[PDB]
Symmetry: D2
Amino acid sequence: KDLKGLYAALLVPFDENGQVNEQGLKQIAQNAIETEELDGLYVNGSSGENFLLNTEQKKQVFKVAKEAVGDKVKLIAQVGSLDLNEAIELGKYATELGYDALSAVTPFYYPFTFEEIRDYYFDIIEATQNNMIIYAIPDLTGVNISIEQFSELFNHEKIVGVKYTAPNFFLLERIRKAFPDKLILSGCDEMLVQATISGVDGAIGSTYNVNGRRARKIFDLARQGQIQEAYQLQHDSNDIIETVLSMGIYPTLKEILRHRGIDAGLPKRPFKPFNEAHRQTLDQLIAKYDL
Amino acid sequence: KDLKGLYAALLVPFDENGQVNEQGLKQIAQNAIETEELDGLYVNGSSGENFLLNTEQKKQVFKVAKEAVGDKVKLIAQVGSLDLNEAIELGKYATELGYDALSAVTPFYYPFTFEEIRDYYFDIIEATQNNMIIYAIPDLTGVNISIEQFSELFNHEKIVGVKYTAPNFFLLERIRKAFPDKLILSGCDEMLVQATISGVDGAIGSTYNVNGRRARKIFDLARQGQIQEAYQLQHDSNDIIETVLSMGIYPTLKEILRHRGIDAGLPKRPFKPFNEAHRQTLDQLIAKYDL
Amino acid sequence: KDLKGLYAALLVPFDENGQVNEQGLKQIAQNAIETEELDGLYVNGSSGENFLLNTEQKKQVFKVAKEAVGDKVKLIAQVGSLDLNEAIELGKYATELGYDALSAVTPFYYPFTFEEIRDYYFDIIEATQNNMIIYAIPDLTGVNISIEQFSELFNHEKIVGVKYTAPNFFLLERIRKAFPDKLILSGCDEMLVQATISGVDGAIGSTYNVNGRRARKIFDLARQGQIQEAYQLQHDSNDIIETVLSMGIYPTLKEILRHRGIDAGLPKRPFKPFNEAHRQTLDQLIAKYDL
Amino acid sequence: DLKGLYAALLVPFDENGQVNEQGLKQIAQNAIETEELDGLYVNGSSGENFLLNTEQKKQVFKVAKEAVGDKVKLIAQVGSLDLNEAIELGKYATELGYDALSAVTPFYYPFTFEEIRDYYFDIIEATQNNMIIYAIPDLTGVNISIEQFSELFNHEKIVGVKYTAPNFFLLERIRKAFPDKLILSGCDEMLVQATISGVDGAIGSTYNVNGRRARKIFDLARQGQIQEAYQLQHDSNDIIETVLSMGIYPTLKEILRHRGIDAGLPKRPFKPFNEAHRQTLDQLIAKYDL
C-alpha cells in the first residue's frame, strides 16, 4: 500500500513485571483506528517503549497489533535495534505478518560512522526485501543525517522515506525539495501544522492515540489553506502536548486512554507510573478538550 | 506606526581599514526600501557587523541610515551591547534621531542570570523611554528564554515584542499563544513560511536585502492561505540562502548588491572578503533567481 | 575481594554472522591477565560491543570470560541494559557465576528522570543482592549525574562505587572528597595520570588490552610521586590512543591483538572491520611501541 | 620568561560602572604583595573587560601597571570583536611596557578558523609584541584543534596559550607537540591536574584571594608531593564551588572587601553580591583564612 496518512505511534500497556498486556494492547490499537480514525499504526516505535523490550515481546506486539486491525489499516513496523541480527529477525517477522513497510531508528549509543549507519539500513533491506523508512530522531540518538547523507540513502529504491522527528525546518524543506518522490512522515506532534505546510505526506505520533481527530483537522485544514483554523487547533493540541509532557508523556497518554475504559496498564520500568499528584490537572485537561 | 512588517537587517559596506563607506551604506538602505519594497530597516543588528564596530561607527550607521530613507519607513535601532552604558548612549542617540523602537540582543559571553538579563532591558528602557524589542538569538548567544521569563519581560509595557531568531516552533507557538498582544518578528529567513503560518507579525532578515520581494509574497500568500505557492517561493528563497551561507553570508549578500551597481565595499575584519573561487557559482545563482 | 586495581574492558571477537568466537574470547581474556598483567576484567562493557548483543550472547561472554581466567582475578559484570528484566536476569546469572560485583550503565535513549534512574539501580541490587558500580559515561548517554544525585545513590550500602568515564576533573575531585569510602575507577585511558593523582582507586579501559603494562607504570609511578616519568608514559600511551581512536578503536585494538597470534575475529555489525587503509600506520605503531 | 602564577585582575566599579581607581590599585597590590603572585593578567574575563569601553580598558591597563613594581610580570588581554580596538589596545599596553599581549578567540559570529588565525596574525603585525592565545570554549563556543594550534604556533610571536578548557587529552597533546611554548592554565579548580600535565603556570580569578594555596599546589605537585598538593586542591575547590554558587566576581570582591579593600560593585548588568549569601561567605572566609 501507499503509505501516506496519519499514524498512531502505538502505545503498549504493561503489567508490574514489564510483561505486555495483550488485551489492553488490542484495545489501544482499535482505539487508534476506530475512535481516532487514523490511517495506520506505527508499531514498536519509541512510543511503544520498544527499546525496553526483549525480542519475544517485540514479536508479540507486532502480532497483536496486526490481529487487532482490518486489512485496510496501514502498518509500519519499527525494527531498528543496536543488534542487527535482531533487527533482521524482526524485519523478517513483520514482513511475514504482512506489515506494509519496515522502519529503523538510526543506530545510537556508539559513535557509528555514516558508512556504518548506511550499511545497517542496506543489510536490513537485503535480508527482508521489504521497504524501509529511516527513523531520524536526533534529540534522543544524537545522530544527525545531512542532506548529502539522505541523498546516499535515498539512492536505494527500497528506502522509501523517512520518519523525521527533528525540529529543523530548513533541513526538512531541503529534504522535501530534493526528494519529491520519497515519503516524509513528521514525528513532532507539536509542530504538525508547520510540517504540513512544509509538504509532509503524513505524520506519526504518540499523541494521535488520544488526539487523532484534531490532528486530522490540522492536517486537512492546513492543506486546504484554512491555515488560521488549522493553527488554532495546533494551539489546542499544544496545550495537550505541553501538559502530558510535564506529567510524563507515555504513562499520561495511557491514563487518558484508561478514562475511555481501556486496560491501559503500566509503563515498563524503569519508567514510573503516572503520579496521582497530577490526577486533578489531567481530569481538567480531558474535560476541556473532550479526550 | 505599528511596527509590523518586513525589514531588511541592514548590511554595511566597509573600506580596507574597517571604516564605514557612507555613500555605499546609503545605497544599501535605499535598495532595501525602493527596490526590495520593504517596510523598514533594522539597523546595527548582527547582519550589520555591529558587534565589530566602535561606538562612533554605530552612531555613524544610525545617522546615515535614518538620512537615507523617508519618514514613512519604519526604523528599529539595535543598541544591545555588553557595555550597558554604551547601549544607553546608543539608545538615547537613536531615539533622538527618531528611531521608532530600540532592540537589544540578550547579554552574552558571560553566563548572566535571567534577573541580570531582565534588568539590562529594564535599565535601557528607563534611561531612553523608547519602546524595546527583545532580540533573542540562542544559536549565537547560548541564551535561552523560557515562556515564564518572557512573561516577566512582557509585563513591562515598553517591551513591545521580540525578534525571534531560533528554530523552535513549539516555543514560537507557545509565545504567540501566551502573548497575542505583543509583536513577534521572525529572524530565520529560511523558515519565513513556517513562521508566517505560526502568526508572526513580520520578519527581519539579512537576505531581504536581496530577496525582499519574494519574502513579501511568501508572507502575504501564506496569510491568505495560498500555502503551496508560498512554500514554492520558500524553496526558491532557500536555494539562495543555502548558497549564500555556503559562501559566507554577509560578504556574499554584499557581492549580490554590487551586481546592482551598489558600492558594497568589504566586510569588516576579521571577516574575510568574498572568495572569488565562488564567483562563477554566485553569477549562476544571480541569473537563475534574477537577483 | 578488594576491587581496587586496573582492569581490561574486555574486547570480544565475532564471526561474520555476529556470533561470539569463544576461542578468541578466551585468548583475549588470557592476554589481559597473563600478558598485560591486569588485576581484572570488566566484562560486557561498551568495549565488548555489549549493546549489540542478545541476552544469550551476553551470558555466553560472562561464562566464557570467567572460565578463561584464574579465580584470583577480579571480575566485574556490566549488566546494564535498557531492558530492566534483562539487567536483572544477567545480574543473577553473573552473580551465580561468581562475579565480584555488577555494574550498570545509566539508562539512556529515553529522557528518564533521575528518580527513574535511581530506582533502576535499586531494583537491580534488590533482585541480585550483589554489589553495584555505577557506570557513568555522559559522552555516549547524555546523562549527567550531579554531586547531589551521586550522594543519593551512594547512600545505598550496595552501591560501592562508580566507573567514571567523563572528562571533568572538578566533578571527579568533588566526588572523591565527598565519598572517600567508595570505589572510583576511571574510564578515560588518555587521562589516567590525571585521574591517578585525583585519587582514583584504579581504572577500567579498552586500551589496557594492549597497553596494560604501561598503564600500571603510570598508575604506580604517579602514586609514588614520580610524576615526570608517569607523565612521559602518558605521552607514549596517548600516542597509541590518539592513533587507535583515529582508526576505529575496537577493531584496531583487536587487530593489535591479532598480531600476538590471537583469533581476534571481526567486530559485530553494524561496526565495520578494521579499514586496511590504516594497516601500514598500525604496523608501524605496533613496532614503535612494542605492542 | 612568563612562567608563573597570575591573578586575573578584578576591577571595582561605582554605581555608574566607572572604574574605582583607588580600589583597583589596592586589588593589584593585594595580588602581588599579599597573595605573592608573579604577575597580573589585566583586562581578561575576570576584569569584566567585555563590559568596558575602550578608554576604560586603557584606564585599567595604566592603573594596574602603575600599582606594581618592575619585577612584576604583566600580560594584557586586548582581544575584542573590534580588531581595530584590539590593535589600538595592543599598541597602548605595549607602549606601557606590558610583557606580552593576549587575545580571546573571536566569538559571537561563526568565524572560520582562517578568520581567527588572521585576527591573531593582524594584531601581532601591528603591535610587534608577543601574543598568548586565550582559549575559553565554554564561553566562546570556539574549539581549537591540535592541527589549528600547530598553525598558530608556527608564528614565532605566538608564544603560548591561556588554556581555560576541561580537556586533559587535548592539553597533553598540546604539551607534547609544543614543548617550547608557554602553557598557562585557566581552570583554577583543576590546577593540580594541569600542573602534573606540565603547564608553565596559571592564570585565575580566585588567585586574588587564594594565590598562596595555589602556589603550594603548583610547587608540591611539581616536587611529587601529590597527596599534599591534592589536599590543597580540595580546600581550593571548596572555595571555588562556594564562590561559583554565589556569583564568582562579586563574591571574590566581597572577600577582598573583608581585607579592607575598596572593592566597589560589579559593572551592570552584573548584579551586586546578594546578602542572602553573607552568612555562608563569612563562614567560608573564617574556615579558610581568606
